[PDB]
Amino acid sequence: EQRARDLADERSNEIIRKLTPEQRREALNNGTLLYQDDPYAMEALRVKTGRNAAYLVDDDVMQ
Amino acid sequence: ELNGVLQDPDMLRRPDSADFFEKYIDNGLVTGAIPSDAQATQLISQAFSDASSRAGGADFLMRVGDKKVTLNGATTTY
Amino acid sequence: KIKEGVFRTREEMEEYRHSRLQEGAKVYAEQFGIDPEDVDYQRGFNGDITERNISLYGAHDNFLSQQAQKGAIMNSRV
C-alpha cells in the first residue's frame, strides 16, 4: 500500500492546483474531473478539502 | 511625478491641481499604479509635506481637504 | 503581494493565486525545458499545496483583520 497511497497524494495535489473551487464543483457533475475513477485520489482530495476548511474556520475564530 | 504640477509655486494655487492630485491618488489606487493602501497613505503624507513647505501651498491644501478618497474600505475627505 | 497589501478581499487573493499558479507552472517549465504537464514536474511543483495555501490564507487574514480595524476607525469618524 505504498504506490496507491503515494499516487493519490500527487493526483489530489494536481486536482487542488489545476482547478479553482468552482471549476471543481461543476467538473464533479459532468464526470470530467481529472481523476474521477481513482477512489484513493478523490478520497485524499476530500480529506485535504477538509483541512483547508479546518484552517479557514479556526483562523477566522482566532482573529 | 507629482513635482511636475505641484512644484511651480504658481501652479499650486491654480484650482485644477487639487483635481490633479485627487485623480492621481484615485487612479493609482484603482489601476494598480498605487498598489497598497498602506502606500497611498505615504504618498498623501509626503505630497502634503512637499506642498505645505512651499510657496503657494496653503490654498492647494485647503482645496484638496474637501476631495473624496477611499482608503482601507472607508471613504472620507482628506 | 499579500503582506504588502494589494489584495483587499479574499476573492482577489484567491483568483490571483490560482491564475499565477497556472501561469508559473507553465512559464518556469518552458524556461527549464521540462514539459509543463510532466508527471514528475507536477509532483514537486504541486507538492504540499494545502500547507502552502494555509500559510498564504493565514498571512492574508492577518492583513484583512488589520485593514478592518483601520477602516472601522476611519469610518467611525465620518
Side-chain angles (χ1 to χ4, degrees):
Chain A
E1 188 65 27
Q2 215 290 337
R3 192 266 309 148
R5 175 186 65 245
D6 181 31
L7 207 63
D9 193 0
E10 183 275 345
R11 295 168 165 197
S12 64
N13 281 5
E14 174 181 16
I15 293 187
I16 295 185
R17 201 268 287 174
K18 207 184 291 189
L19 292 174
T20 176
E22 291 300 328
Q23 297 159 4
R24 275 168 61 178
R25 200 175 164 182
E26 79 173 354
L28 267 172
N29 305 6
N30 292 32
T32 325
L33 193 48
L34 283 168
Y35 311 109
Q36 181 55 257
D37 44 29
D38 207 326
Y40 285 159
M42 268 180 60
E43 184 266 348
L45 170 80
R46 286 187 297 268
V47 170
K48 301 185 181 184
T49 290
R51 270 164 39 196
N52 191 4
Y55 186 77
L56 284 185
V57 166
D58 176 22
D59 168 78
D60 305 0
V61 160
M62 168 74 97
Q63 289 305 320
Chain B
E1 177 207 352
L2 261 177
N3 291 6
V5 293
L6 261 67
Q7 190 172 45
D8 206 37
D10 49 307
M11 203 35 73
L12 281 167
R13 62 177 61 92
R14 295 272 324 263
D16 67 57
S17 276
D19 273 3
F20 172 93
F21 193 64
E22 184 181 4
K23 283 311 184 174
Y24 181 63
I25 287 298
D26 273 357
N27 289 12
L29 287 167
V30 158
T31 77
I34 304 171
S36 169
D37 286 7
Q39 201 209 336
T41 293
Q42 286 216 300
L43 268 45
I44 290 154
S45 157
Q46 168 192 248
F48 282 169
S49 154
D50 266 345
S52 87
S53 277
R54 167 175 299 153
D59 58 359
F60 162 65
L61 260 58
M62 207 182 43
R63 203 156 279 96
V64 70
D66 278 7
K67 302 317 220 73
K68 289 299 203 106
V69 77
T70 296
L71 278 195
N72 290 148
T75 184
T76 188
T77 71
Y78 287 73
Chain C
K1 262 156 184 172
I2 286 188
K3 89 165 68 163
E4 165 185 79
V6 181
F7 323 102
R8 280 136 190 86
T9 328
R10 186 168 282 170
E11 284 76 31
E12 289 142 48
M13 205 275 302
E14 280 173 359
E15 182 270 356
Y16 187 78
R17 164 66 164 175
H18 166 80
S19 184
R20 293 285 266 157
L21 276 180
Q22 266 66 239
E23 319 302 357
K26 203 268 162 183
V27 163
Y28 286 130
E30 59 82 15
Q31 173 195 10
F32 279 111
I34 293 93
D35 196 19
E37 179 148 359
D38 213 338
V39 195
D40 39 8
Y41 190 58
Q42 279 180 351
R43 160 163 289 99
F45 187 89
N46 321 301
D48 261 8
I49 191 82
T50 288
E51 273 67 12
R52 296 196 279 163
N53 268 15
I54 283 173
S55 199
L56 282 198
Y57 282 137
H60 172 67
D61 208 349
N62 280 349
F63 178 86
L64 256 195
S65 158
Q66 78 101 38
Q67 165 161 50
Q69 304 285 269
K70 285 189 191 169
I73 291 166
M74 283 178 198
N75 217 323
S76 187
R77 169 202 306 288
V78 308

